[PDB]
Design a protein around this nucleic acid. Structure first.
Ligand SMILES: [Mg+2]
Ligand SMILES: [Mg+2]
Ligand SMILES: [Mg+2]
Ligand SMILES: [Mg+2]
Ligand SMILES: [Mg+2]
Ligand SMILES: [Mg+2]
Ligand SMILES: [Mg+2]
Ligand SMILES: [Mg+2]
Ligand SMILES: [Mg+2]
Ligand SMILES: [Mg+2]
Ligand SMILES: [Mg+2]
Ligand SMILES: [Mg+2]
Ligand SMILES: [Mg+2]
Ligand SMILES: [Mg+2]
Ligand SMILES: [Mg+2]
Ligand SMILES: [Mg+2]
Ligand SMILES: [Mg+2]
Ligand SMILES: [Mg+2]
Ligand SMILES: [Mg+2]
Ligand SMILES: [Mg+2]
Ligand SMILES: [Mg+2]
Ligand SMILES: [Mg+2]
Ligand SMILES: [Mg+2]
Ligand SMILES: [Mg+2]
Ligand SMILES: [Mg+2]
Ligand SMILES: [Mg+2]
Ligand SMILES: [Zn+2]
Lengths: 116, 178, 77, 134, 48, 119
RNA sequence: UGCCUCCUAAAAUGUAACGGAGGCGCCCAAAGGUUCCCUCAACCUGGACGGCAAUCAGGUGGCGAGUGUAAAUGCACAAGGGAGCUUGACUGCGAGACUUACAAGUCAAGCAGGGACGAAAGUCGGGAUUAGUGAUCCGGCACCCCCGAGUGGAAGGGGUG
RNA sequence: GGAUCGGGGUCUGCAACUCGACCCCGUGAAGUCGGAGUCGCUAGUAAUCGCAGAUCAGCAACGCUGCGGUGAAUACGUUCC
């Protein structure tokens, strides 16, 4: 049952099943199921087509989805790169941008150990 | 009778009249064929392609595909002659028409982060090539009874003599462009 | 000294070439040009041969000619 | 001058008969050394003549060598009887015929160029002469 | 690896034809319809 | 073009078969040429290139044949057979002209066989 | 050290050196026969993974590809690529040739039998061709029943493979 | 699991980029129990859970010193370290 292109796996409940969407979390699902009237306790294999119509418009008219968040996030990190800011330079060089310690850490922004 | 076709004769032919001044009524370009190709390199390992890239296009294109065999040997690709290295289908006629019709109707606008696809992709004579990256583009194939995701690469070969009229007829057919 | 006899062998000369020239009267079966490959092609009344030998199917006179670039041997009866 | 590779490392001696039919006139420079007898001209002879040219002119002008020593001449090892195979190639040679132009100069000065060219002829195992571009 | 195998006619057991064969390419004892002069006609000539 | 490709391929095919099949004065080439509309046939004897007999589905007696191009091919087959008899020919070699043996060409050949002409 | 290919070799053939180069002592049950169909490489343009080069599409491209295997001669008309059916990778022969000291080696139309493929015409006595081989002797095996040491057998010998 | 990032903010501080803390949404890495080796702990202990304070406008408070909730298993014994 492809909702918007994320293809929810079956045998799952709504409030978390919607969370697989890139851009919709649990707190978001609390309102996607609230403004559409769909109950929290349900199996997605029992989802009605008319109900999928009821949330095939609310999401696209009041939320924002796959693609048109990824494009925005790459767009603004690209803007920081292009403007020559401290954050942009730091993002190019791959070490932490929020002033994290770079002496015995920064492994998350860097890769595995090197051991020169 | 395919409705896109009936409407093709209804308006696109005479629109191509009103746009290009072809001297003879048969100069009008038309999509001659559509070639859908797999180009699978992940079959030379463990030689799995039958129920992955055959029973999918049997439902997608509707016709049983050709297993395109290797032609030369490449050491960098670990490939020898005589291995299944591609899968091809060539679509003509009303069924090709219905395939594009279904694609534009309920298949093409479903690909993720899709906004229209490049119009510069022409080869200079009037044929068009692009690709996809997931089987769920078509209703006919479900996700609870398939393997890993793949994609198909499409040539659409027209009788157009050049790119502007090839693109014109693709637009009139309903292909999105940016 | 150096034992540079690395190349001192050869095969027998096979006596190839044209055996019956133009205008020469031959009997049937008589080989006209023994050769490797089809340096000459069988024309009218000339057979080819398992090793490309170009014999005469019939008696008569050998004649050489050109058939679309291909040079051919034939017999006129 | 050494061929960077040769298909046939052991060839027959190049044949020294006849007047040169190609490379007979001065084609790039305006002065030329032209042979008047047959000889095999080695790469060492060619090089020595070229150095004679270029350090008689010291600067300016330019030198063409329309002769390349790509024909190998073999040599049996020094202390050997006849006939245990062909020797290894060790001389590289150009087959020059009477009339072949061996070297060409372009030089703004006339006498310096002419003297350089004779300086090179004196380096060569051959009778030669200066000819011009008409 | 290419032994000389004889073919015998199935009817009169007459060992008529000798040829060669690759044992690994075809391990089984092969058959061909060959002309049998004793029978005066073509029959199967399986190996011995 | 598709027409050019068909014409070149068909000439290629018929040259291929023409290498081995020649036809002579005593047994000539019965060569076929079917268009989408008509089928012509002609008996060649190409030692001098003199067509000794010919027939087609263009004359009114074949045009008015009740039936389809199978029947209009059997008509021309019998016709070429009868005028081969008239010219004094009973055995020929049959040249497919580069087309597949079958269909209207095979119908013509069978009609030519059934009434005297004996390739 | 035998065989095959080239050059030397002087435009028929042939031609020596401890002259210059390489191959062979096989492989293929299809890579044989036949019928039908096809045309390559390379380059250019466009194309999810995929890039210089995997598959695709369109052009251009007559042979620069390929040919089981060296080289030469050939082969695009294909002998190169593919598919169907097959066993002629026959039996009995063979006019006439090439080559040749001899022994050998080689080609062969065509006739018959019984087949394969083909609608027919036709083609097929292995392989595009030329290496992949060993005289005679002495034996072995299968068949034929030819001889069978007084006679019937047999032994043993003989023929054909 | 909550590092990481984008965006939006609150508070302090004249001032938050170098270099503060806290909050919301979406994003959701390494990590599936860690080798040689090595540490602490005998009872209200280990373990685990919060709370408080000093320093301090604010705070990288997971550091340090304290408070309490639940709350264990084993120790035959000195051969060995
Ligand atoms: Mg030779
Ligand atoms: Mg042979
Ligand atoms: Mg010249
Ligand atoms: Mg097999
Ligand atoms: Mg000669
Ligand atoms: Mg001579
Ligand atoms: Mg050797
Ligand atoms: Mg075959
Ligand atoms: Mg072929
Ligand atoms: Mg044999
Ligand atoms: Mg004979
Ligand atoms: Mg027969
Ligand atoms: Mg038949
Ligand atoms: Mg024969
Ligand atoms: Mg061979
Ligand atoms: Mg003896
Ligand atoms: Mg007795
Ligand atoms: Mg007795
Ligand atoms: Mg006995
Ligand atoms: Mg006999
Ligand atoms: Mg969590
Ligand atoms: Mg992990
Ligand atoms: Mg786990
Ligand atoms: Mg404080
Ligand atoms: Mg302070
Ligand atoms: Mg405590
Ligand atoms: Zn038998």
């Amino acid at each position: 049952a492809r909702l918007v292109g994320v293809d929810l796996p079956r045998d799952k409940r709504m409030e978390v099943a919607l969370t697989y969407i890139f851009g919709i979390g649990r707190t978001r699902s609390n309102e996607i199921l609230a403004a559409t009237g769909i109950d929290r306790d349900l199996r997605t294999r029992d989802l009605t087509e008319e109900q999928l119509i009821h949330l095939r418009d609310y999401i696209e008219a009041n939320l924002k989805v796959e693609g048109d968040l990824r494009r925005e996030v790459q767009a603004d990190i690209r803007r920081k790169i292009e403007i020559g800011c401290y954050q942009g330079l730091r993002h190019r060089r791959g070490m932490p941008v929020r002033g994290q310690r770079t002496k015995t850490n920064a492994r998350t922004r860097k890769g595995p150990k090197r051991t020169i | 009778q395919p409705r896109l076709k009936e409407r093709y004769r209804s308006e696109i032919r005479d629109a191509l009249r009103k746009q290009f001044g072809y001297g003879n009524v048969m100069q009008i370009p038309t999509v001659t064929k559509v070639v859908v190709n797999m180009g699978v390199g992940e079959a030379a390992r463990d030689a799995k392609l039958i129920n992955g890239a055959v029973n999918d296009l049997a439902l997608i294109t509707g016709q049983k595909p050709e297993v395109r065999r290797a032609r030369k040997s490449i050491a960098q690709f670990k490939l020898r002659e005589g291995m299944p290295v591609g899968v091809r289908v060539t679509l003509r006629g009303d069924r090709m028409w219905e395939f594009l019709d279904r694609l534009t109707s309920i298949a093409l606008p479903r690909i993720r982060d899709f906004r229209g696809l490049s119009p510069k992709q022409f080869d200079g004579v009037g044929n068009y090539t692009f690709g996809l990256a997931e089987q769920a583009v078509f209703h006919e194939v479900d996700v609870d009874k398939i393997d890993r995701v793949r994609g198909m690469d499409i040539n659409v070969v027209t009788s157009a003599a050049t790119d502007d009229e090839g693109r014109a007829l693709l637009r009139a057919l309903g292909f999105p462009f940016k | 000294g150096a034992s540079s006899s690395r190349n001192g062998r050869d095969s027998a000369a096979q006596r190839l070439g044209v055996k019956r020239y133009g205008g020469q009267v031959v009997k049937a079966g008589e080989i006209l040009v023994r050769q490797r490959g089809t340096k000459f092609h069988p024309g009218v009344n000339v057979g080819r041969g398992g090793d490309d030998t170009l014999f005469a199917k019939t008696a008569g006179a050998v004649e050489f000619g050109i058939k679309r670039g291909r040079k051919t041997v034939s017999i006129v009866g | 001058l050494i061929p960077r590779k040769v298909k046939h490392r052991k060839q027959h001696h190049p044949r020294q008969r006849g007047i040169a039919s190609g490379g007979t006139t001065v084609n790039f420079g305006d002065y030329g050394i032209q042979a008047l007898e047959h000889a095999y001209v080695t790469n060492r002879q060619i090089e020595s003549a070229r150095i004679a040219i270029n350090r008689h002119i010291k600067r300016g002008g330019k030198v063409w060598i329309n002769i390349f020593p790509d024909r190998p001449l073999t040599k049996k090892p020094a202390e050997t009887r006849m006939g245990s195979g062909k020797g290894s190639p060790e001389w590289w040679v150009a087959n020059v015929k009477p009339g072949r132009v061996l070297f060409e100069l372009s030089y703004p000065n006339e006498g310096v160029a002419r003297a350089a060219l004779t300086r090179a002829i004196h380096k060569l195992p051959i009778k030669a002469r200066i000819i011009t571009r008409e | 690896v290419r032994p000389k195998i004889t073919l015998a006619c199935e009817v009169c057991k007459h060992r008529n034809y000798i040829t060669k064969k690759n044992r690994r390419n075809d391990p089984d004892r092969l058959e061909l319809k060959k002309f049998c002069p004793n029978c005066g006609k073509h029959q199967a000539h399986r190996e011995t | 073009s598709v027409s050019a490709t068909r014409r070149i391929s068909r000439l290629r095919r018929h040259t291929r078969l023409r290498k081995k099949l020649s036809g002579t004065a005593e047994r000539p080439r019965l060569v076929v040429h079917r268009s989408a509309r008509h089928i012509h046939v002609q008996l060649v004897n190409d030692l001098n290139g003199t067509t000794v007999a010919a027939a087609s589905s263009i004359e009114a007696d074949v045009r008015g044949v009740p039936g389809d191009k199978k029947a209009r091919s059997v008509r021309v087959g019998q016709l070429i057979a009868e005028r081969a008899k008239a010219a004094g020919i009973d055995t020929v070699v049959f040249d497919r002209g580069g087309y597949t043996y079958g269909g209207r060409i095979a119908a013509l050949a069978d009609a030519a066989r059934e009434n005297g002409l004996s390739f």
